[PDB]
């Protein structure tokens, strides 16, 4: 792919809208719209990436490449077939990416798109939202069971916390929906403070599954949250906490 564009502005804000949801526009400018629709089950996924030519002029040598770090490539298997290199004016084309999670991962793939448009050369780079929580599935459990598991994860490096300013209104119902969207079960009457949220789930990867517990604590007067994750793996607590911290 030769010289690669630096990540488009808005790439990171956009990437964050795709963590608890599967459907959306990932990138759009005056020439091109990139849309996604995905679904996951256990350690697998299927993503549809749609490329729309918003102009009256054909794109030639239209070349989407997915670019992964050397470690990412060992943790995540992406399979696709490239699009035809010519995209007509007004057309939307697509590709299907078949995804297999081999083990826990923290980096995101980059989608790089290059093409000719008239006499110009176009180069777009954006982060692809394939994230560890996409392999996160809910675990329902009573309070007693929760606290047993919580107390088993008492090593310092198993726990990660973050304190942050709410980006959105601290809307109870929407907060519950994003926790669910993230892949967690929402467990009621575990924290005796009814303002607090508690979650459990399991990450499903080809080689190992990791049990995860979470607690979110809003302070509506201060407009701030504390999120605590405990998992058996420091990298998994880290990643899920960073991800989940950007949702509220």
């Amino acid at each position: 792919p030769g010289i690669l564009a630096p990540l488009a502005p808005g790439s990171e804000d956009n990437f964050a809208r795709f963590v608890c949801k599967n459907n959306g526009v990932l990138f759009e400018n005056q020439l091109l719209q990139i849309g996604l629709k995905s679904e996951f089950r256990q350690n697998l996924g299927r993503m549809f990436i749609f490329y729309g030519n918003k102009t009256s002029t054909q794109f030639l040598n239209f070349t989407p490449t997915l670019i992964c770090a050397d470690d990412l490539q060992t943790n995540l298997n992406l399979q696709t077939k490239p699009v035809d290199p010519t995209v007509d004016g007004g057309a939307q084309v697509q590709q299907v990416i078949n995804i297999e999670c081999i083990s826990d991962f923290t980096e995101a793939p980059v989608l790089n798109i290059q093409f000719r448009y008239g006499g110009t050369f176009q180069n777009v780079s954006v982060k692809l939202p394939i994230t560890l929580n996409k392999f996160f599935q809910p675990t329902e459990m009573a309070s007693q069971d929760f606290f047993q598991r919580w107390k088993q994860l008492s090593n310092p490096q198993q726990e990660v916390q973050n304190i942050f300013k709410a980006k959105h209104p601290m809307d109870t119902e929407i907060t519950k929906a994003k926790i669910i969207g993230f892949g967690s079960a929402l467990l009621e009457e575990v924290d005796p403070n009814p303002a607090n949220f508690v979650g459990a789930g399991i990450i499903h990867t080809k080689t190992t599954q990791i049990g995860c517990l979470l607690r979110l604590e809003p302070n509506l007067q201060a407009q701030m949250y504390r999120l605590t994750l405990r998992t058996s793996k420091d990298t998994v607590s880290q990643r899920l906490c960073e991800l989940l911290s950007e949702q509220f």
Binding site: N23, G24, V25, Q33, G35, L36, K37, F50, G52, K54, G90, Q92, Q94
Partner: peptide
Amino acid sequence: PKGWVTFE
């Protein structure tokens, strides 16, 4: 373009 998949 109205023939496109949309992402609402």
